Design a protein around this ligand. Structure first.
Ligand SMILES: *[C@@H]1O[C@H](CO[C@@H]2O[C@@H](C)[C@@H](O)[C@@H](O)[C@@H]2O)[C@@H](O[C@@H]2O[C@H](CO)[C@@H](O)[C@H](O)[C@H]2NC(C)=O)[C@H](O)[C@H]1NC(C)=O
Ligand SMILES: *[C@@H]1O[C@H](CO)[C@@H](O)[C@H](O)[C@H]1NC(C)=O
Ligand SMILES: *[C@@H]1O[C@H](CO)[C@@H](O)[C@H](O)[C@H]1NC(C)=O
Lengths: 195, 107, 111
């Protein structure tokens, strides 16, 4: 708004050559930039664009204190878990939204970039935890969790991989997910476009 | 999209060392991806090395980058060579993109 | 490593579609997370830019005029409309996120 001429680097989030594991996701902060949500809308949203608390149509004129971009890769059937009120392996152990979230979740099919014929095994996720994960919490440690009936200082009585291959139907294809979390009017707003 | 800027050229005598500059535009990162690539006079292009490592060639060409700016530091420990090549700075984070510079040695 | 571009050069007629190809003994994966094959364009006096291919059908990059394809042991790049802009040398490369080996280049001249 107040003579900001910088443009928001959405391309440095959305066009990235490498994406993070579900846990240890990339978290970038955008500030002191003019928003332009024309680009992130009906250009390349592909599969989905679901917002909570805002009407995407007028998103360019709202003005946020800060915008945070959480970026990661998940299996396609799990896309529905990146949403307020959801449960499951991603929602409970890897990435959780607050249920009063005011941002936008954008996702698309990356099978052509991430899947390999032999299988892309570089994407990991958390399967086990002693308790559920809190919103935006990150925990990247390894605990050889599967004690079963005996505490272990060995292996088992940790984390698991995804297997991404171009032919595993549809629900098993990888998806790139970007979550734009909005910090609205907690301090005078800094990021908007036309206003 | 992301542009790179490099010093246009360098010239120095054999036995001396040089450093080649590069900076990228951008705002933030968790990590780094980049490559130094060389184009010998009249040949195709060769990899010099990735984030400070080697392409298989070691010795004269070594390097150490700090960040997204001064992301460069290609260093030649010795100019006693016929390596009067064009060097390129390659961006590896959004869309691959190249910029380059000419480094020579006089007689 | 083979990385060899077959044609020396293409026809110079403006408006005439033409194609080039690169052969290898490295036809499948080279990379760590994806594929094994790219094309670069170097205009005289300029740094190269990127055109993108894969093992299974795929094609990307910034311009939408060009088309990549391949089969067997040979990778192909073709140009449809020829505006005489595409004058320079086209090269084949095998890395991805991963660095690379590289081909010899082929000359495209348009008159
Ligand atoms: C992200 O990149 C696109 C262009 O990238 C293309 O599409 C991607 C999905 C991928 O396949 C790439 O390999 C492709 O090259 C940017 O789109 C540009 O938007 C401006 C808006 O004014 C338009 O003028 C350009 O013509 C578009 N470019 C192309 C090639 O069509 C997009 O802006 C980038 N940023 C974001 C946040 O998406
Ligand atoms: C975006 O595209 C949908 C159709 O996919 C259309 O109904 C909608 O009106 C478009 N939005 C805007 C702001 O034009
Ligand atoms: C935001 O984008 C929509 C797209 O239809 C446009 O109509 C609207 O005028 C833009 N907002 C402002 C404040 O101009």
């Amino acid at each position: 708004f107040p003579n900001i001429t910088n443009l928001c680097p959405f391309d440095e989030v959305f066009n990235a050559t490498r994406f993070a594991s579900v846990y240890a996701w990339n978290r970038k902060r955008i500030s002191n930039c003019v928003a332009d949500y024309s680009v992130l809308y009906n250009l390349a949203p592909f599969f989905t664009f679901k917002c909570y608390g805002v009407s995407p149509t007028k998103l360019n004129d709202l003005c946020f204190t800060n915008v945070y971009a959480d970026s990661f890769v998940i299996r396609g059937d799990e896309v529905r878990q990146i949403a307020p009120g959801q449960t499951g392996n991603i929602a409970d152990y890897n990435y959780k939204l607050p249920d009063d979230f005011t941002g936008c979740v954008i996702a698309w099919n990356s099978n052509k970039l991430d899947s390999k014929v032999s299988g892309n095994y570089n994407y990991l996720y958390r399967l086990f935890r002693k308790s559920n994960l809190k919103p935006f919490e990150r925990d990247i440690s390894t605990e050889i969790y599967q004690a079963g009936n005996k505490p272990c200082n060995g292996v088992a009585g940790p984390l698991r991989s995804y297997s991404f291959r171009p032919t595993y139907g549809v629900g098993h294809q990888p998806y790139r997910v970007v979550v734009l979390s909005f910090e609205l009017l907690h301090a005078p707003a800094t990021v908007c476009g036309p206003k | 999209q992301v542009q790179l800027v490099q010093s246009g050229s360098e010239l120095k005598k054999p036995g001396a060392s040089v450093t080649v500059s590069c900076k990228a535009s951008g705002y933030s990162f968790p990590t780094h991806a980049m490559n130094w690539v060389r184009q010998a006079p009249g040949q195709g292009l060769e990899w010099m090395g990735w984030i400070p490592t080697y392409a298989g060639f070691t010795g004269r060409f070594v390097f150490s980058l700090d960040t997204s700016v001064s992301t460069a530091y290609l260093q030649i420990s010795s100019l006693k060579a016929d390596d009067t090549a064009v060097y390129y700075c390659a961006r590896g984070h959004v869309l691959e993109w190249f910029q380059g510079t000419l480094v020579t040695v006089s007689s | 490593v083979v990385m060899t571009q077959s044609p020396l050069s293409l026809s110079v007629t403006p408006g005439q579609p033409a194609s080039i190809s690169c052969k290898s003994s490295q036809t499948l994966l080279h990379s760590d997370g994806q594929t094994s094959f790219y094309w670069y364009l170097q205009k005289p006096g300029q740094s190269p830019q990127l055109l993108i291919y894969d093992i299974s059908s795929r094609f990307s990059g910034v311009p939408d005029r060009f088309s990549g394809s391949g089969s067997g042991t040979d990778f192909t790049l073709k140009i449809s409309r020829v505006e005489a802009e595409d004058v320079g040398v086209y090269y084949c490369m095998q890395g991805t996120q991963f660095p690379w080996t590289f081909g010899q280049g082929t000359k495209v001249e348009i008159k």
